[PDB]
Amino acid sequence: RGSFVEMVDNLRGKSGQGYYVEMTVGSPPQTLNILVDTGSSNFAVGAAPHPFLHRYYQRQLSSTYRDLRKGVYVPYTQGKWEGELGTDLVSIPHGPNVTVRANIAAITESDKFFINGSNWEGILGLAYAEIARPDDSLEPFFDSLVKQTHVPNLFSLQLCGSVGGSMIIGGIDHSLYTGSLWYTPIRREWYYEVIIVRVEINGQDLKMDCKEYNYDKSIVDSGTTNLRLPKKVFEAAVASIKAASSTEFPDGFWLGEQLVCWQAGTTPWNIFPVISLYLMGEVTNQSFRITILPQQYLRPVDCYKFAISQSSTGTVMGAVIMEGFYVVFDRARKRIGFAVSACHVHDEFRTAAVEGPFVTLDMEDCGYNI
Ligand SMILES: NCCc1ccc(O)c(C2CCCCC2)c1
């Protein structure tokens, strides 16, 4: 219940190319590296010899494959993926010792989806049925896992910023964090939706109507690299970080339109402010705060990209946030826990922090309604 040595260090990746876990599909087992994505709900894998792919799901080789005789099409702003639905037997070698029948989308056509040079071949959507494609009747993987086994209804993620981490399926590993876990309610079970109630740059409040911090929504998404902020909030946030770091920068850098370079080992972390998000707590009028460093929001590509950007889909707490913390997706109790990660990158002056309780009024007003 508190120690899962089998699952520690079961994630791999490359900077900016997401985190992946090893999975097997079909009988006999076909090994595939699968992107871990808490911002989507489909289990989808390359099923055809796309040139970018190390390997792909070969349905003809599996005796346990069952065709659902149904297509699925997933567009993105950029490109897309398209495939054929089926079910097959699925395991996670460095996960719980179980095998489940899950829906799988065999990807037959895609655009700007697979990354040239990456080491993953599919995507594991860990969010809820509501945002599954083509509709909410297509049971997501984790739902299937919980339904078919005795694996507890929760998972946790330690993303360490090439890169590595841990996905603990069915529990929490206490060696992966220090201090205490603090929980924020899952507002609605579709994305992992939460509510930000206050934002501070270097301890200084933005003083914005908190409703705007969640304009549209705020989600925890392991499939996104950046901390993404709603347009208006991003404007204020950049304006504050820009002013907090007026010690040394082009206009395009803040918009993610170009990179900025320093000499090796001369990176001025200290000119940059810490960023705190206060999240709604479990108790009426109670919140807690998570604090990240420039180590998190300045992502190396010594050339770094500013890893905070604007959004029209709301706040996205991507890898920038998540790499500072151990994150518990406590589905059984409709909450997400945050604790200081035992593996986060820091200096001798400042570290990532999770602190509470704080008194925050009108936290319900911060939620944006349709
Ligand atoms: N919900 C979609 C998740 C997703 C799909 C295809 C991708 O190529 C990516 C990459 C974008 C850059 C960051 C790493 C992962 C993410």
Short mmCIF file of C-alpha atoms and ligand atoms in Angstrom, two decimals:
data_model
loop_
_atom_site.label_atom_id
_atom_site.label_comp_id
_atom_site.label_asym_id
_atom_site.label_seq_id
_atom_site.Cartn_x
_atom_site.Cartn_y
_atom_site.Cartn_z
CA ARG A 1 0.00 0.00 0.00
CA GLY A 2 2.94 2.38 0.55
CA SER A 3 5.80 0.68 -1.34
CA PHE A 4 5.72 -0.38 -5.00
CA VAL A 5 9.38 -1.13 -5.90
CA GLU A 6 8.33 -2.94 -9.11
CA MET A 7 6.91 0.31 -10.50
CA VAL A 8 9.59 2.80 -9.41
CA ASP A 9 11.47 4.27 -12.40
CA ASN A 10 9.04 2.69 -14.91
CA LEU A 11 8.86 5.89 -17.01
CA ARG A 12 11.26 7.08 -19.67
CA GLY A 13 11.36 9.96 -22.12
CA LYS A 14 13.24 12.76 -23.84
CA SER A 15 12.93 16.45 -22.98
CA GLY A 16 9.84 17.89 -24.66
CA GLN A 17 8.83 14.47 -26.08
CA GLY A 18 6.63 13.29 -23.19
CA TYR A 19 6.88 10.39 -20.73
CA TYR A 20 6.24 6.80 -21.78
CA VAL A 21 5.65 3.45 -20.11
CA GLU A 22 6.22 -0.07 -21.48
CA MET A 23 3.03 -1.99 -22.26
CA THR A 24 2.12 -5.29 -23.90
CA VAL A 25 -0.88 -5.89 -26.14
CA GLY A 26 -2.31 -9.14 -27.45
CA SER A 27 -1.32 -12.80 -27.24
CA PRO A 28 1.46 -13.47 -27.53
CA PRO A 29 2.47 -10.14 -25.88
CA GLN A 30 3.64 -7.36 -28.22
CA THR A 31 5.78 -4.82 -26.36
CA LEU A 32 5.12 -1.11 -27.05
CA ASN A 33 6.23 2.13 -25.43
CA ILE A 34 3.16 4.21 -24.64
CA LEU A 35 2.92 7.93 -23.85
CA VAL A 36 1.27 8.60 -20.49
CA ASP A 37 -1.42 11.24 -21.00
CA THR A 38 -3.74 12.44 -18.22
CA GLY A 39 -5.28 14.93 -20.66
CA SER A 40 -7.03 12.37 -22.87
CA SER A 41 -9.00 9.13 -22.53
CA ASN A 42 -8.20 6.87 -25.50
CA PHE A 43 -5.73 4.00 -25.57
CA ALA A 44 -4.37 4.38 -29.11
CA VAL A 45 -1.36 2.71 -30.72
CA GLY A 46 0.38 2.77 -34.10
CA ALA A 47 -0.85 -0.24 -36.08
CA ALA A 48 0.93 0.34 -39.41
CA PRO A 49 4.59 0.78 -40.48
CA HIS A 50 4.86 4.57 -40.24
CA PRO A 51 8.53 5.51 -40.87
CA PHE A 52 8.89 7.31 -37.49
CA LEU A 53 7.94 4.17 -35.51
CA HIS A 54 10.26 1.63 -33.87
CA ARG A 55 7.34 -0.78 -33.77
CA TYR A 56 3.58 -1.05 -34.01
CA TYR A 57 0.60 -3.20 -33.05
CA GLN A 58 0.21 -6.13 -35.46
CA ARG A 59 -3.35 -7.33 -34.89
CA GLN A 60 -2.91 -10.34 -37.23
CA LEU A 61 -0.41 -11.79 -34.74
CA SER A 62 -2.83 -11.67 -31.80
CA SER A 63 -5.21 -14.55 -31.07
CA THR A 64 -7.15 -12.51 -28.48
CA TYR A 65 -7.91 -9.49 -30.71
CA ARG A 66 -11.60 -8.68 -31.29
CA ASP A 67 -12.76 -6.20 -33.95
CA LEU A 68 -15.34 -3.61 -32.88
CA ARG A 69 -16.13 -2.81 -36.55
CA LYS A 70 -15.97 0.90 -35.79
CA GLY A 71 -13.70 3.76 -36.78
CA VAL A 72 -12.50 6.73 -34.75
CA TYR A 73 -11.17 10.12 -35.90
CA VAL A 74 -9.33 12.50 -33.57
CA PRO A 75 -8.52 15.93 -35.01
CA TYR A 76 -6.10 18.40 -33.44
CA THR A 77 -5.35 22.05 -34.29
CA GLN A 78 -2.13 20.81 -35.87
CA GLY A 79 -2.79 17.36 -37.31
CA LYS A 80 -4.72 14.25 -36.27
CA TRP A 81 -4.93 10.51 -35.75
CA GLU A 82 -7.44 8.03 -37.13
CA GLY A 83 -7.95 4.35 -36.45
CA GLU A 84 -9.95 1.16 -36.05
CA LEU A 85 -11.44 0.17 -32.70
CA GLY A 86 -11.03 -3.25 -31.12
CA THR A 87 -10.31 -4.90 -27.78
CA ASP A 88 -7.37 -7.06 -26.75
CA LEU A 89 -5.47 -8.29 -23.69
CA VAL A 90 -3.26 -5.63 -22.11
CA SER A 91 -0.54 -5.78 -19.43
CA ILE A 92 2.01 -3.38 -17.93
CA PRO A 93 5.28 -5.30 -17.33
CA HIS A 94 6.60 -2.77 -14.76
CA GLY A 95 3.11 -2.29 -13.34
CA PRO A 96 0.57 -4.45 -11.48
CA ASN A 97 0.78 -8.19 -12.25
CA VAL A 98 -2.60 -8.34 -14.03
CA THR A 99 -3.92 -8.67 -17.58
CA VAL A 100 -7.08 -6.91 -18.75
CA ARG A 101 -9.28 -6.72 -21.82
CA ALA A 102 -9.23 -3.08 -22.92
CA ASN A 103 -10.37 -0.98 -25.85
CA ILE A 104 -7.54 -0.18 -28.26
CA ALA A 105 -7.62 2.20 -31.20
CA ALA A 106 -5.37 0.81 -33.92
CA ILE A 107 -3.97 3.95 -35.56
CA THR A 108 -3.96 3.52 -39.36
CA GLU A 109 -3.47 7.17 -40.39
CA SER A 110 -2.03 10.20 -38.62
CA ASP A 111 -0.62 13.67 -39.19
CA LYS A 112 1.80 15.55 -36.91
CA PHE A 113 1.13 12.99 -34.20
CA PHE A 114 4.19 10.74 -33.99
CA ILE A 115 7.50 12.49 -33.35
CA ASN A 116 10.45 11.78 -35.64
CA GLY A 117 13.14 10.36 -33.36
CA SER A 118 10.91 9.55 -30.38
CA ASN A 119 10.78 6.11 -28.76
CA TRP A 120 7.02 5.75 -28.23
CA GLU A 121 4.36 4.28 -30.54
CA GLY A 122 1.06 5.00 -28.82
CA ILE A 123 -0.85 6.95 -26.22
CA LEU A 124 -2.50 5.94 -22.95
CA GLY A 125 -5.41 8.22 -22.15
CA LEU A 126 -5.78 8.19 -18.36
CA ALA A 127 -8.66 10.71 -18.05
CA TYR A 128 -12.41 9.92 -17.92
CA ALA A 129 -14.94 8.43 -20.39
CA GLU A 130 -16.66 11.80 -20.88
CA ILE A 131 -13.90 12.94 -23.25
CA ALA A 132 -13.29 9.52 -24.86
CA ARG A 133 -13.67 9.27 -28.65
CA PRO A 134 -15.88 8.75 -30.45
CA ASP A 135 -18.10 8.94 -27.32
CA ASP A 136 -18.31 8.23 -23.56
CA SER A 137 -19.45 4.63 -24.08
CA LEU A 138 -15.89 3.69 -25.11
CA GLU A 139 -14.49 2.60 -21.74
CA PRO A 140 -11.01 4.08 -21.06
CA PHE A 141 -8.13 1.79 -20.07
CA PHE A 142 -8.00 2.67 -16.38
CA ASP A 143 -11.75 2.14 -15.97
CA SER A 144 -11.31 -1.32 -17.55
CA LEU A 145 -8.36 -2.06 -15.26
CA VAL A 146 -10.28 -1.15 -12.07
CA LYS A 147 -13.45 -2.95 -13.23
CA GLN A 148 -11.68 -6.22 -14.08
CA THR A 149 -9.14 -6.50 -11.23
CA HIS A 150 -8.63 -5.67 -7.53
CA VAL A 151 -6.28 -2.77 -8.42
CA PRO A 152 -7.39 0.26 -6.33
CA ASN A 153 -8.94 3.16 -8.25
CA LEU A 154 -5.99 5.57 -8.21
CA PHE A 155 -2.59 6.11 -9.79
CA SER A 156 0.27 8.49 -9.07
CA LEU A 157 2.92 10.19 -11.19
CA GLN A 158 6.46 11.24 -10.35
CA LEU A 159 7.84 13.03 -13.42
CA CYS A 160 11.56 13.82 -13.14
CA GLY A 161 12.85 16.41 -15.60
CA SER A 162 17.20 11.92 -20.84
CA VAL A 163 14.17 12.02 -18.52
CA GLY A 164 12.59 9.41 -16.25
CA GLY A 165 9.92 8.95 -13.62
CA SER A 166 7.41 6.62 -12.01
CA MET A 167 3.80 5.72 -12.63
CA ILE A 168 2.50 3.92 -9.55
CA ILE A 169 -0.68 2.13 -10.57
CA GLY A 170 -3.13 1.35 -7.76
CA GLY A 171 -1.37 3.27 -5.02
CA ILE A 172 1.16 5.68 -3.61
CA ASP A 173 4.89 5.21 -2.97
CA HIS A 174 6.01 7.30 0.02
CA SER A 175 9.68 7.21 -1.05
CA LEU A 176 8.72 9.37 -4.07
CA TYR A 177 7.88 12.45 -2.01
CA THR A 178 8.82 14.45 1.09
CA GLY A 179 6.57 16.28 3.53
CA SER A 180 2.82 15.87 3.24
CA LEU A 181 0.30 15.36 0.44
CA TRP A 182 -2.25 18.13 -0.07
CA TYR A 183 -5.46 17.42 -1.96
CA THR A 184 -7.60 19.51 -4.32
CA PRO A 185 -11.08 18.33 -5.50
CA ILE A 186 -11.54 16.97 -9.00
CA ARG A 187 -14.19 19.50 -10.04
CA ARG A 188 -15.69 17.29 -12.73
CA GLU A 189 -14.72 13.85 -14.01
CA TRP A 190 -13.80 14.47 -17.64
CA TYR A 191 -10.32 15.96 -17.76
CA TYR A 192 -8.58 16.03 -14.37
CA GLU A 193 -10.22 19.39 -13.67
CA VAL A 194 -9.23 21.46 -10.63
CA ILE A 195 -9.66 25.06 -9.42
CA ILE A 196 -6.91 27.66 -9.02
CA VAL A 197 -7.96 30.27 -6.47
CA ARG A 198 -4.86 32.48 -6.30
CA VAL A 199 -1.65 33.08 -8.26
CA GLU A 200 1.52 34.67 -6.87
CA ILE A 201 4.69 35.74 -8.65
CA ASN A 202 7.50 35.85 -6.07
CA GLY A 203 4.92 35.97 -3.27
CA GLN A 204 3.09 38.86 -4.94
CA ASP A 205 -0.55 38.32 -5.92
CA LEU A 206 -1.88 38.98 -9.43
CA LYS A 207 -5.09 40.38 -7.90
CA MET A 208 -7.14 39.04 -10.81
CA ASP A 209 -10.71 37.80 -10.56
CA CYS A 210 -9.93 34.17 -9.77
CA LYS A 211 -12.68 33.03 -12.20
CA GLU A 212 -10.24 33.94 -14.94
CA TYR A 213 -7.48 31.59 -13.65
CA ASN A 214 -9.90 28.86 -14.65
CA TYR A 215 -11.35 30.61 -17.70
CA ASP A 216 -12.77 27.69 -19.48
CA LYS A 217 -11.00 25.31 -17.07
CA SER A 218 -7.83 24.22 -15.30
CA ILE A 219 -6.53 20.69 -15.76
CA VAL A 220 -3.61 18.46 -14.82
CA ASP A 221 -2.19 17.05 -18.06
CA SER A 222 0.95 14.90 -18.27
CA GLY A 223 0.78 15.06 -22.10
CA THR A 224 1.51 18.82 -22.24
CA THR A 225 5.02 20.18 -21.70
CA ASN A 226 4.14 23.74 -20.71
CA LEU A 227 2.33 25.52 -17.95
CA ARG A 228 -0.43 26.99 -20.07
CA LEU A 229 -2.34 30.01 -18.79
CA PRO A 230 -5.57 31.62 -20.07
CA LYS A 231 -4.79 34.59 -22.33
CA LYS A 232 -5.66 37.37 -19.84
CA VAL A 233 -3.87 35.55 -16.99
CA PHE A 234 -0.83 34.87 -19.17
CA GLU A 235 -0.67 38.59 -19.98
CA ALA A 236 -0.65 39.54 -16.28
CA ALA A 237 1.66 36.66 -15.34
CA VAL A 238 4.27 37.54 -18.00
CA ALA A 239 3.98 41.25 -17.13
CA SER A 240 4.80 40.37 -13.51
CA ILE A 241 7.61 37.89 -14.29
CA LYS A 242 8.98 40.36 -16.87
CA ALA A 243 9.08 43.10 -14.20
CA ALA A 244 10.43 40.71 -11.54
CA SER A 245 13.32 39.83 -13.86
CA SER A 246 14.16 43.29 -15.24
CA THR A 247 17.76 42.57 -14.14
CA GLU A 248 18.53 41.29 -17.66
CA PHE A 249 15.31 40.07 -22.96
CA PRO A 250 13.57 40.15 -26.38
CA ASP A 251 9.77 40.47 -26.72
CA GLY A 252 9.42 37.23 -28.72
CA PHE A 253 11.02 35.11 -25.98
CA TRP A 254 8.00 35.61 -23.69
CA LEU A 255 5.61 34.55 -26.48
CA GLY A 256 7.65 31.41 -27.22
CA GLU A 257 8.61 32.84 -30.62
CA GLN A 258 12.37 32.42 -30.06
CA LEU A 259 14.88 30.90 -27.64
CA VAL A 260 17.29 32.60 -25.23
CA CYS A 261 20.87 31.48 -24.61
CA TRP A 262 23.46 31.83 -21.85
CA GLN A 263 26.98 30.42 -21.46
CA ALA A 264 27.19 26.93 -19.91
CA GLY A 265 26.68 27.10 -16.13
CA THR A 266 25.96 30.85 -16.13
CA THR A 267 22.15 30.50 -16.17
CA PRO A 268 20.75 33.25 -13.91
CA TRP A 269 18.05 31.30 -12.02
CA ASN A 270 17.87 33.91 -9.23
CA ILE A 271 16.82 36.85 -11.43
CA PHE A 272 13.69 34.77 -12.10
CA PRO A 273 10.82 34.63 -9.56
CA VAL A 274 9.12 31.61 -8.00
CA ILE A 275 5.53 30.95 -9.10
CA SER A 276 2.82 29.85 -6.70
CA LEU A 277 -0.58 28.44 -7.56
CA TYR A 278 -3.09 28.21 -4.75
CA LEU A 279 -5.50 25.36 -5.29
CA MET A 280 -8.90 24.79 -3.73
CA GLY A 281 -8.58 22.58 -0.64
CA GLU A 282 -10.73 19.75 0.74
CA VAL A 283 -12.28 22.04 3.36
CA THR A 284 -14.60 25.04 2.92
CA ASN A 285 -12.56 28.28 2.84
CA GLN A 286 -9.31 26.27 2.95
CA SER A 287 -6.65 26.20 0.25
CA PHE A 288 -2.99 25.21 -0.12
CA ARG A 289 -0.25 26.34 -2.46
CA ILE A 290 2.25 24.73 -4.76
CA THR A 291 5.42 26.62 -5.69
CA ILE A 292 7.62 25.98 -8.76
CA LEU A 293 11.04 27.32 -9.75
CA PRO A 294 12.51 28.75 -12.99
CA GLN A 295 14.14 25.29 -13.24
CA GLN A 296 10.61 24.13 -14.10
CA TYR A 297 9.37 26.94 -16.37
CA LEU A 298 12.66 27.50 -18.22
CA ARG A 299 13.01 24.31 -20.27
CA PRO A 300 16.42 23.50 -21.82
CA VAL A 301 16.42 22.70 -25.56
CA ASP A 302 22.61 26.66 -22.86
CA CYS A 303 19.39 27.55 -24.72
CA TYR A 304 16.04 27.49 -22.93
CA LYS A 305 12.43 27.93 -24.02
CA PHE A 306 10.03 29.92 -21.83
CA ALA A 307 7.67 27.10 -20.90
CA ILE A 308 4.68 29.25 -19.94
CA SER A 309 2.27 30.07 -22.76
CA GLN A 310 -1.21 31.41 -23.50
CA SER A 311 -4.26 29.23 -24.06
CA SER A 312 -7.83 29.31 -25.30
CA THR A 313 -8.61 26.00 -23.56
CA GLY A 314 -7.85 27.25 -20.03
CA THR A 315 -5.03 26.50 -17.60
CA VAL A 316 -2.98 23.38 -18.30
CA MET A 317 -0.70 22.13 -15.57
CA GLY A 318 1.67 20.23 -17.82
CA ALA A 319 5.13 18.81 -17.15
CA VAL A 320 6.39 22.23 -15.99
CA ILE A 321 4.15 22.01 -12.92
CA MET A 322 4.16 18.23 -12.54
CA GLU A 323 7.96 17.83 -12.58
CA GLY A 324 8.10 19.71 -9.27
CA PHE A 325 5.71 17.35 -7.50
CA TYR A 326 4.49 13.88 -6.78
CA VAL A 327 0.96 13.88 -8.12
CA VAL A 328 -1.74 11.50 -6.92
CA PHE A 329 -4.74 10.98 -9.15
CA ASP A 330 -7.04 9.81 -6.40
CA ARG A 331 -10.00 8.81 -8.54
CA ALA A 332 -11.80 6.88 -5.79
CA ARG A 333 -12.10 10.09 -3.73
CA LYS A 334 -12.38 12.58 -6.62
CA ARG A 335 -9.25 14.50 -5.66
CA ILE A 336 -5.68 15.16 -6.75
CA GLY A 337 -2.84 15.24 -4.24
CA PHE A 338 0.36 17.23 -4.47
CA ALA A 339 3.59 16.77 -2.53
CA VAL A 340 7.18 17.86 -3.03
CA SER A 341 8.81 15.36 -5.39
CA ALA A 342 11.89 13.57 -4.03
CA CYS A 343 13.40 14.01 -7.52
CA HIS A 344 12.68 17.62 -8.57
CA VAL A 345 15.46 19.85 -9.94
CA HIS A 346 16.48 22.67 -7.57
CA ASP A 347 19.36 24.85 -6.33
CA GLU A 348 20.82 25.62 -2.88
CA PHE A 349 18.66 28.75 -2.44
CA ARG A 350 15.12 27.63 -3.39
CA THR A 351 13.10 24.39 -3.67
CA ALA A 352 9.61 23.39 -4.85
CA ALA A 353 7.04 23.56 -2.07
CA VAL A 354 3.54 22.45 -1.10
CA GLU A 355 2.22 24.44 1.87
CA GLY A 356 -1.03 24.84 3.79
CA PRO A 357 -3.52 25.49 5.07
CA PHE A 358 -4.34 28.98 3.86
CA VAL A 359 -7.65 30.78 4.33
CA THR A 360 -9.27 31.63 0.99
CA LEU A 361 -12.84 32.90 0.67
CA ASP A 362 -15.21 32.59 -2.31
CA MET A 363 -13.23 29.73 -3.87
CA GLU A 364 -16.45 28.52 -5.56
CA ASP A 365 -16.64 31.79 -7.53
CA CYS A 366 -13.32 30.78 -9.15
CA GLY A 367 -14.99 27.99 -11.12
CA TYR A 368 -16.13 28.94 -14.61
CA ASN A 369 -19.58 27.63 -15.61
CA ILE A 370 -20.71 26.80 -19.18
N1 LIG B 1 -3.53 14.61 -25.83
C1 LIG B 1 -2.51 14.57 -26.90
C2 LIG B 1 -1.14 14.13 -26.36
C3 LIG B 1 -0.06 14.15 -27.41
C4 LIG B 1 -0.28 13.60 -28.68
C5 LIG B 1 0.72 13.61 -29.65
C6 LIG B 1 1.96 14.18 -29.33
O1 LIG B 1 2.94 14.18 -30.29
C7 LIG B 1 2.22 14.73 -28.06
C8 LIG B 1 3.56 15.33 -27.74
C9 LIG B 1 3.49 16.87 -27.88
C10 LIG B 1 4.77 17.54 -27.36
C11 LIG B 1 4.89 17.23 -25.87
C12 LIG B 1 5.12 15.73 -25.67
C13 LIG B 1 4.05 14.85 -26.35
C14 LIG B 1 1.19 14.71 -27.11
#
